[PDB]
Design a protein around this nucleic acid. Structure first.
Lengths: 493, 141, 722, 548
RNA sequence: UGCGAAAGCAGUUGAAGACAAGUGGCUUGUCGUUCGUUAAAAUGGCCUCGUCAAACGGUGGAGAGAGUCGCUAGGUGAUCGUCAGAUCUGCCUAGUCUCUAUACAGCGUGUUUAAUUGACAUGGGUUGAUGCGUA
């Protein structure tokens, strides 16, 4: 003898635009927070090491938020002009911020009162400041001087290397994630230059011609880097100096990018992109940078980031808008005498020769319609169908199980006016859908076959039959006009 | 479980599909809304796509699709097909859009090489809408 | 396994091409020849041979058989007790049999058993014998109605009789005939009580000393089997629900065992303490064959210790005096209380007079592990034939197949039929096609559903997993006449090609990106004629497809999936109209292809583009198989030839119920009949396992194949410590 | 087993090069080349050369001269390189190697001492093999394969100077013993009609096949298992098939003995010394669909009649499934003799042709299934009645009831008798849809319209109807719409076909509004009779009466 | 029942004998009876082996639910009123707008492409339904 097969929920052929695993995962980022800033949020970085805090650069202050309360734990307000960039070191121990007066100031993180050193860079505004990702004691600052600088933070008087060569407004750095001698910089003339730092450094080894003025350049692999600027982003193989993908799925200019790897996700890698029209989108680097999910925000989105790869807790997607506000969407995560008497209940057979196992697994709880179909209470199963809190596929599957299994007539025999009105009042709603309407058709046909006299007596289901008639009239106009559209594009083959 | 006990039937997470998804191979006109529609379809903007196709004046729809670029009438038709597949009460108002896209762009999507493969979702939606027409004929009789 | 046909010792008892009524009717555990010394069994057959056979070690090459001095009688059974032996015999008005009991002796001349003739019973309707074999009850039909008589056979301890109107109620005489028809009876080891199970569903324990009855009503359809325990305080019953109940006769309390994959047509306790129940399960979802599962089970936890079954095919028609068992109503799975005699007369007349005598089935071979997959009704029996025992059984449709024992009205519902299943050529996927039938008397009762399912397993687990299903492939209400798995060159042997009766084709293939088996290619023509004489073949290269629709063998390519074309017109013949609708387009290798149609059997080369050979089929296979079953009647190889197969229903001095099979092989485009074999029984399916053999399935399901000091201390210690 | 048949030194270049093929010349000084221009210098010429190759550099070129050695040339720059003589007998077929791939000092006389591709690099002396008349070089593991007229096969590998295998191959005087296309075999042609493939790793024959006809200049192509062959006194270069990723279409091999057939690509016009015309332009051998085109090397058709399963005690046949008969007495001699009995002076009568056919085939004279027949036999008797004699009432009624009529049906509109024409509409089982559409749109306004629309719907696919009913005028379709609107199911879907196949825009308006009104009322009546087909207690006080 | 396609297309439904009931016959009905024809009901339903809670991975969704009288399109009502139109800030539907633990559904996590842990002495005894009201 077997166990009883479970009642299989009636699944129809799948409709278009189903819920992909990528968009289910990215759709459980919810409970949005909107924090109004004093000015447009230009940059946002995350702590790498305990990857659980993030710094938001508004105008003339940098606020570190926590990734468990989403309130400002700490804030950095002693800047003279607009602070532009603020990033954490790879050890997460200190925080660099480039400022509109060309004064890079690096504090230590989680202590806003101890400014550790103030590199006086160019007289022009310094727009991007980030530490090396391999090395710890070098900091790369590009400014509106069309020259980036590598500074050793011990010798903070002269820059240890001066990467010039770009004709207009260098706004982004990036480091290549396995070769630590390799700095890719990006400017408003297009032309991602990139430099070997053992060489002279006043000339790039090559240049990648993004045609639009680039807004950001990040590095995905040790080999391929992604530059956004203009309406698209392009990806570039770096061992072969050559473009290989470009996605232009926006309306306005892509402002920023960042990238995730190895995190707990159906997507093994994810590049998300923020694009001055409200949209932030996530692209999957493994199937050809195809877009998988997106968010629309209440204004032009200027910068975005996500929690880093090892977040281990409450996971965040943050987007700062040009409107001057900040949007966070997170996904969350008896007696010693009595115990000495009941000691052994946690042993589970380690030193024991034979280990027997016949405890059956406890299956899912049966719903009332399923146990009534099991107990052969077929009219009670119909009654349990037409309760209000039932799913539409559950009402459909108990109708289909009574149709295939036994008898519609058995399920409908002892009824009268007051006990048929649930069925017909659901058949009004079920006649609209394609997946239900065959079952609704034969159930209504059987109930008017064997209750044609109650039709005469009760007037308060006559009107239900009339409403059902106008419903089938609307549906038959729809099923006729669908055949007309089917013919009118059969003509166009 | 017993060795004579038969294996029960269980679908599990099997994808149930139909046999019809072929997914594999000066001014003087009006004030329309087609710039809105065009830069709804260049991206995938469901929000302002909804605000452009909740307009339901027939002449506005007509010359909007007339002023539309014919390289993206196929993706406007794909969006309309998926929306009437999902929401069934939209089939009334939205198929006014799909009959005008075929009438106006009657050359582009007859010169396209795979019509059914490119707008499969429309074919599957209309096939499942019009397949059951004898059944509700018998029902209303 | 003591094979009968292995040796002339008892294949000389039966190897006949016409006579299989020689049957094996009882096995006894002792040795009837010499007493007091047992590891060997004495089998009594239904004619009168008594063979003594050793089943410990090798079978002896000359058994101890005898032949008892018997009249025209035909050996109902034998009976054992302490020492003595009885036998019972059947006879020659109203068609009833007649029974006669003898006693045996052996000793004086050791060739013959002498008999004694205790008594007779001159009209018997139904009979049963107690568990110890100490007494037996039966029915009489002696006038206004029948009668019931119990008799101890190994002694004149008791013999009583009474008309069963004193058993029956007063309500039953004004009710239907099911309320007074009796389909079961049983007695206990004392003869104090007796269980009469009626066709209406009730059971009644009469107390034989005073004829007071007790009614037990649980079975909602007919009661088919009853047994008592040894002490007589528990009654096992089984019926048309697949639920074995056991009635605690003290408190009238049932214990159930509900889903037993077959109706219980016999149940009995078995052990000395009654620790086993043995059951016979009739498995009546297929009406074309009576296929019984033997299932004992230990009584402790009610788990199936040693379930036994043969191969279970479903033939296209009913076979040979097959009667679906009795019930309350006349259904499509049973027959009512009246129609058994008329049904067996009609079935004999159908086998005699009629013309469509095709009862052929489809069997598949899993190309990985060489076990064969009989698709039962809504299920498959996976069965390996190098030990002829079932691997397992699996439900592949969504019916009420397992959840419920259907009864009197509900037996007019059928679970979906699996009509095609084919494995992909690497054995990784199983394609199956099923027809889902609707219940009658509603609006959708005349439109079927057609479901094509795709199953997967790794090479360890015994049961498959549904990865995808497409309901209505090819469109609504249109069937699939033929599915064909694809060779190893299209999508690494992961494609299937399904054919309509419109001549439409759909190529489905599994791609890993969207991790599912999806619809790749399509060629639909929209005709207004339909025919299920559709066949399909593929080039081994994976380049061109031979679509053998009716009267027409189209040639499609694979790249554009339309009819084949070369612009140079190098006699590009891409259609072959033949004299009748074609039912096999089997291409042996990439040179040539054998077409078989209902008149002729052609062969066509393509490196020399014309007909090379032809044969005559119409005198043999005329209007006898349904159009689409020659594909399962003939088959091929991958190197070494092709196999035709015809059937001759034998004759008297009119056709009869007897058959013979003429199978023939050809090598290398119909050149030589290098195999001309004749089998003694109807043959139903033949197919090539993937290592140069051809297996075939007999109509009584025998799978056959066409191939190419210290020593005495040790002995006495193993004696005395065992 | 042929291919697409038409067209009656660096070995991997093409055009856009200067001269990557510099070769010797018959009855000339030594050698030459041409362009579609590289210099023709000397490789120490003026000897008895029979072929010429290079080191795959074209400025390290040579003249492979019959003097036991060879030197380098300067065909681009002017700077020569040095050399060193090994033998002095015959090095006319010298083949310089790549960077250490396959080279040895074998000139002509069994002295195959191994060396490298250099002027002073040496190796072992692998002259162990006997006097070989067919020494080739392949890339199994780069190897000299010797076939000797002392007859014996041997295979040495010039990778470590290692004799891989060798046996006794009894090869006679050959025509072309060329290595295979994948190199795994040796295609050696016998003189007139044969080409055998031998296993060139073990020196044994693997498949000895015959060929189609006369062919002399044969060599394996850059294919899977295919060769090209030019006729001896013919410019016909045919192809046969007994590289697999994206194969060759031209510039495969240059070995031919035609009218100076040097540098043989597909378009082989601009030769290296010849300046000839060109031919076929196909690719190499495909998988299996081109062998339905090249269905050659077998032309042995006879008259195939239906045989029978051989009567080995056929008297126990056990209830044959026919009506009354058991087996038709086959008379193929009488089938052939019925042609002589029919082609007679019954030039307008059915006394010596129709009675002859119905006596040779005793049927009901409108029915199949008492077959024993051949398509050539039916075609020849149909030719004999299409000659001096449709006025027969039995023969040309019982044989459009035959599924082998073979395309002599085109005049079925061109002759017009009512009963024979309707019978050829219904039952003639191969009909041209061109004539069917002409008969359909040449309307006589009758029920034969329904009978022709039936067959045009029930044996042709809808798109093959549409593409060949584009081939109509507009008066036909306007009168067709007018006749449908005037005065059924198959013609409704035929009307759907004509509306799908007329096109999109070029219509008129009044006919369209008339058709719109007609089909509006047609859908209304179809809806109402579909509705018709789908359409097929006690009170408290009474007062009644009873009997008095 | 036969031919069929899944539609449909042709064919029907006799005789003997026995028994039962009703009034030796006559009527009616049955048949663990034969020959010929291709031919609804006996109150009578499916076992235990461990539940509960919280996750996680795929699969579907008509989404489970709540607002804004915010827009678009409608269907319609009470009373008065010649209509015009008034008040009910008229009601209902669908779409849009906004938000939530994707709230909904289902399969699985014993090995699987993937994905699980934890509570509880899994007993016995006494009330517990006539002790209860927020309606």
């Amino acid at each position: 003898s077997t166990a009883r097969p479970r009642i299989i929920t009636s699944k129809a052929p799948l409709l278009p635009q189903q819920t992909t695993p990528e968009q289910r995962y990215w759709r459980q980022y919810t409970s949005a927070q909107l924090v109004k800033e004093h000015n447009s949020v230009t940059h946002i970085s995350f702590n790498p090491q305990h990857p659980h805090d993030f710094a938001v650069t508004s105008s003339t202050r940098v606020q570190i938020f926590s990734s468990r309360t989403r309130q400002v734990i700490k804030t950095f307000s002693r800047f003279k002009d607009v602070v532009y960039s603020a990033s954490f070191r790879s050890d997460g121990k200190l925080l660099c911020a480039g400022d509109a007066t060309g004064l890079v100031s690096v504090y230590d993180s989680y202590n806003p009162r101890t400014i550790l050193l103030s590199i006086n860079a160019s007289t022009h505004p310094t727009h991007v400041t980030k530490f090396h990702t391999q090395d710890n004691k070098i900091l790369a600052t590009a400014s509106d001087d069309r020259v980036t600088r590598l500074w050793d933070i011990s010798n903070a008087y002269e820059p240890q290397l001066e990467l010039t060569g770009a004709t207009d407004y260098v706004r982004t750095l990036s480091f290549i994630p396995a070769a630590p001698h390799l700095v890719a910089t990006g400017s408003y003339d297009g032309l991602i230059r990139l430099y070997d730092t053992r060489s002279s450094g006043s000339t790039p080894i090559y240049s990648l011609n993004h045609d639009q003025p680039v807004e950001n350049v990040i590095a995905v692999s040790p080999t391929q880097i992604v530059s956004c600027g203009g309406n698209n982003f392009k990806v570039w193989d770096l061992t072969s100096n050559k473009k290989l993908y470009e996605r232009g799925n926006f309306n306005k200019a892509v402002t920023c990018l960042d990238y995730v790897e190895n995190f707990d996700s159906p997507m093994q890698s994810a590049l998300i992109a923020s694009s001055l029209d409200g949209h932030v989108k996530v692209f999957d680097p493994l199937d050809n940078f195809q877009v998988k999910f997106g968010w629309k925000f209440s204004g032009p989105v200027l910068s975005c980031a996500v929690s880093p790869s090892t977040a281990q807790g409450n996971r965040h997607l943050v987007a700062g808008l040009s409107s001057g506000l900040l949007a966070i969407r997170t996904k969350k995560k008896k007696s010693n005498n009595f115990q000495r008497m009941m000691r052994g209940s946690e042993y589970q057979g380690d030193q024991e020769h034979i280990i027997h196992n016949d405890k059956v697994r406890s299956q899912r709880r049966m719903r009332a319609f399923e146990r009534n179909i099991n107990q052969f209470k077929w009219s009670e199963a119909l009654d349990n169908a037409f309760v209000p809190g039932m799913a539409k596929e559950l009402t459909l599957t108990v109708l289909q199980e009574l149709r295939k299994r036994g008898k519609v007539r058995v399920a409908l025999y002892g009824r009268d006016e007051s006990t048929l009105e649930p069925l017909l009042n659901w058949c009004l709603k079920g006649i609209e859908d394609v997946r239900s309407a065959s079952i609704v058709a034969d159930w209504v046909a059987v109930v008017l076959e064997l209750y044609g006299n109650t039709l005469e007596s009760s007037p308060v289901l006559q009107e239900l039959m009339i409403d059902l008639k106008t419903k089938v009239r609307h549906e038959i106009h729809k099923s006729k006009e669908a055949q007309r559209i089917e013919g009118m594009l059969q003509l166009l083959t | 479980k017993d060795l004579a006990s038969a294996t029960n039937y269980v679908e599990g997470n099997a994808r149930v599909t139909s046999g019809d998804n072929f997914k594999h191979v000066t001014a003087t006109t009006t004030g329309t809304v087609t710039v809105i529609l065009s830069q709804a379809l260049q991206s995938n903007d469901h929000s302002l796509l909804e605000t452009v196709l909740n307009n339901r004046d027939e002449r506005v729809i007509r010359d909007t699709i007339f002023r539309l670029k014919p390289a993206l009438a196929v993706i406007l038709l794909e969006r309309l097909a998926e929306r009437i597949a999902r929401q069934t009460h939209r089939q009334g108002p939205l198929n006014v859009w799909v009959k005008w896209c075929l009438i106006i762009h009657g050359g582009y999507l007859v010169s396209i090489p795979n019509l059914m493969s490119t707008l499969s979702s429309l074919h599957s939606t209309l096939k499942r809408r019009s397949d059951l027409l004898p059944r509700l004929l018998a029902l209303d009789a | 396994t003591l094979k009968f046909a292995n040796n002339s010792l008892l294949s000389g008892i039966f190897l006949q091409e016409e006579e299989n009524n020689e049957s094996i009717v009882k096995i006894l555990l002792g040795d009837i020849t010499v007493p007091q010394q047992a590891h060997l069994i004495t089998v009594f057959t239904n004619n009168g041979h008594v063979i003594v056979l050793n089943y410990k070690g090798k079978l002896v090459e000359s058994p101890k058989h005898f032949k008892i001095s018997l009249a025209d009688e035909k050996l109902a059974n034998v009976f054992h007790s302490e020492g003595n032996y009885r036998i019972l015999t059947t006879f020659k008005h109203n068609s009833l049999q007649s029974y006669r009991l003898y006693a045996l002796t052996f000793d004086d001349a050791k060739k013959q058993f002498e008999v004694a003739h205790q008594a007779e019973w001159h009209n018997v309707i139904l009979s049963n014998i107690s568990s110890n074999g100490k007494l037996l009850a039966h029915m009489c039909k002696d006038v206004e109605h029948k009668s019931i008589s119990v008799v101890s056979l190994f002694d004149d301890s008791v013999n009583l009789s009474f008309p069963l109107g004193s058993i029956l109620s007063s309500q039953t005489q004004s009710l239907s005939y099911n309320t007074r028809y009796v389909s079961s009876m049983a007695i206990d080891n004392m003869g104090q009580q007796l269980a009469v199970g009626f066709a209406s569903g009730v059971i009644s324990i009469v107390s034989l000393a005073d004829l007071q009855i007790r009614l037990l009503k649980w079975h909602i359809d007919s009661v088919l089997s009853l047994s008592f325990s040894h002490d007589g305080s528990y009654l096992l019953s089984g019926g048309w629900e697949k639920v074995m109940s056991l009635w605690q006769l003290e408190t009238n309390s049932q214990q159930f065992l509900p889903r037993l994959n077959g109706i219980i047509i016999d149940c009995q306790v078995l052990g000395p303490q009654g620790n086993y129940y043995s059951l016979i399960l009739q498995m009546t979802e297929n009406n074309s064959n009576s296929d019984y599962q033997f299932l004992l089970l230990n009584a402790s936890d009610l788990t199936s210790k040693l379930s036994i079954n043969g191969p279970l095919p479903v033939f296209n028609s009913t076979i040979k005096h097959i009667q679906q068992p009795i019930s309350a109503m006349n259904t499509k799975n049973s027959n009512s209380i009246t129609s058994l005699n008329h049904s067996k007369k009609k079935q004999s007349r159908k086998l005699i007079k009629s013309r469509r005598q095709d009862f052929t089935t489809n069997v598949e071979i899993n190309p990985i592990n060489k076990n064969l997959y009989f698709p039962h009704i809504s299920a498959v029996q996976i069965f390996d034939f190098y030990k002829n025992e079932q691997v397992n059984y699996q439900y592949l449709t969504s019916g009420v197949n397992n959840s419920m024992g259907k009864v009197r009205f509900e037996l007019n519902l059928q679970d979906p039929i699996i009509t095609d299943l084919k494995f992909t050529k690497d054995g990784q996927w199983m394609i199956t096609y099923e027809i889902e039938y609707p219940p009658n008397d509603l609006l959708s009762s005349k439109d079927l559903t057609h479901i094509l399912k795709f199953w997967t397993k790794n090479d360890n687990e015994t049961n498959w997993n549904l990865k995808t299903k497409v309901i209505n492939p090819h469109g609504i209400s249109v069937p699939i006449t033929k599915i064909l798995p694809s060779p190893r060159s299209v999508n690494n042997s992961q494609g299937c090609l399904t054919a309509d009766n419109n001549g439409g084709l759909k190529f489905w293939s599994f791609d890993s990106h969207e991790s599912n088996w999806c619809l790749k290619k399509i060629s639909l023509p929209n005709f207004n004629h339909f025919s299920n004489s559709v066949s399909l073949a593929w080039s081994q290269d994976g380049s061109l497809i031979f679509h053998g629709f009716d009267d027409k063998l189209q040639i499609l390519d694979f790249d554009t999936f339309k009819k084949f074309e070369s612009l140079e017109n190098t006699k590009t013949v891409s259609e072959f109209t033949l004299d009748s609708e074609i039912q096999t387009v089997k291409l042996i290798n990439d040179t040539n292809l054998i077409v078989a149609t209902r008149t002729t059997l052609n062969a066509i080369n393509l490196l020399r583009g014309q007909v090379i050979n032809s044969f005559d089929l119409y005198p043999f296979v005329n209007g006898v198989y349904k159009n689409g079953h020659m594909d399962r009647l003939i088959t091929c190889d991958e190197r070494t030839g092709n196999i035709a197969l015809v059937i001759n229903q034998q004759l008297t001095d009119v056709p009869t119920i007897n058959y013979k099979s003429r199978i023939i092989i050809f090598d290398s485009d119909l050149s030589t009949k290098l195999g001309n074999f004749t089998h003694h029984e109807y043959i139903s399916w033949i197919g090539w396992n993937y290592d140069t053999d051809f297996i075939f399935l007999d109509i009584e399901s025998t799978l056959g194949v066409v191939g190419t000091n210290s020593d005495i201390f040790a002995e006495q210690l193993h004696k005395l410590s065992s | 087993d042929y291919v697409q048949v038409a067209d009656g030194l660096m070995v991997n270049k093409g055009n856009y090069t200067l001269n990557v093929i510099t070769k010797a010349l018959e009855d000339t000084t030594d050698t030459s080349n041409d362009h579609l221009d590289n210099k023709a210098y000397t490789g120490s010429d003026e000897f008895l050369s029979q072929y010429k190759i290079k080191a795959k550099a074209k400025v390290m070129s040579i003249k492979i001269d019959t003097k036991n050695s060879l030197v380098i040339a300067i065909l681009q720059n002017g700077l020569i390189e040095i050399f060193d003589f090994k033998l002095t007998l015959l090095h006319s077929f010298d083949i310089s190697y790549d960077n250490l791939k396959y080279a040895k000092w074998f000139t002509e006389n069994g002295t195959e001492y191994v060396f490298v591709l250099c002027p002073l690099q040496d190796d072992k002396v692998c002259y162990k093999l006997l006097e070989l008349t067919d020494c080739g070089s392949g890339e199994s593991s780069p190897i000299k394969e010797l076939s000797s007229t002392i007859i014996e096969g041997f295979s040495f590998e010039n990778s470590k100077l290692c004799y891989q295998f060798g046996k006794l191959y009894k090869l006679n005087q050959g025509k072309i013993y060329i290595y295979s296309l994948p190199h795994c075999q040796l295609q050696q042609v016998i003189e007139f009609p044969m080409v055998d493939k031998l296993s060139p790793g073990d020196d044994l024959i693997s498949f000895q096949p015959v060929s189609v006809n006369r062919v002399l200049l044969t060599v394996n192509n850059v294919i899977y298992l295919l060769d090209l062959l030019h006729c001896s006194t013919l410019s016909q270069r045919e192809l046969t098939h007994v590289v697999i990723n994206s194969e060759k279409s031209h510039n495969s091999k240059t070995i031919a003995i035609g009218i100076s057939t040097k540098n043989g690509p597909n378009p082989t016009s601009s030769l290296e010394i010849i300046n000839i015309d060109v031919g076929t332009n196909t690719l190499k051998d495909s998988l299996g669909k081109s062998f339905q085109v090249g269905n050659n090397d077998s032309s042995v058709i006879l008259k195939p009649l239906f045989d029978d399963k051989d009567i080995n005690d056929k008297r126990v046949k056990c209830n044959d499934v026919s009506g009354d008969s058991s087996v038709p007495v086959l008379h193929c001699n009488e089938v052939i003799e019925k042609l002589s009995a029919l082609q007679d002076n019954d030039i307008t009568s059915f006394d010596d042709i129709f009675f002859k056919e119905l006596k040779i085939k005793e049927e009901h004279y409108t029915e199949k299934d008492r077959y024993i027949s051949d398509p050539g036999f039916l075609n020849k008797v149909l030719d004999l009645i299409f000659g001096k004699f449709p006025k027969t009432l039995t023969f040309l009624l019982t044989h459009p009831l035959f599924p082998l009529s073979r395309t002599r049906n085109l005049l079925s509109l061109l002759r017009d008798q009512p009963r024979l024409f309707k019978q050829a509409i219904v039952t003639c089982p191969n009909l041209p849809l061109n004539e069917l559409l002409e008969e359909l749109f040449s309307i006589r306004n009758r029920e034969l319209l329904l009978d022709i629309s039936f067959r045009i719907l029930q044996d042709f696919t809808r798109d093959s109807i549409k593409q060949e009913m584009k081939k109509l005028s507009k008066l036909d379709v306007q009168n067709f719409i007018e006749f449908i609107t005037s005065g059924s199911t198959q013609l409704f879907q035929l009307l759907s076909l004509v509306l799908d196949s007329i096109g999109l825009f070029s219509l008129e308006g009044a006919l369209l509004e008339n058709l719109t009104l007609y089909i509006d009322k047609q859908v209304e009546i179809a809806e109402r009779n579909t509705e018709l087909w789908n359409l097929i207690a006690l009170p408290t006080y009474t007062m009644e009466y009873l009997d008095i």
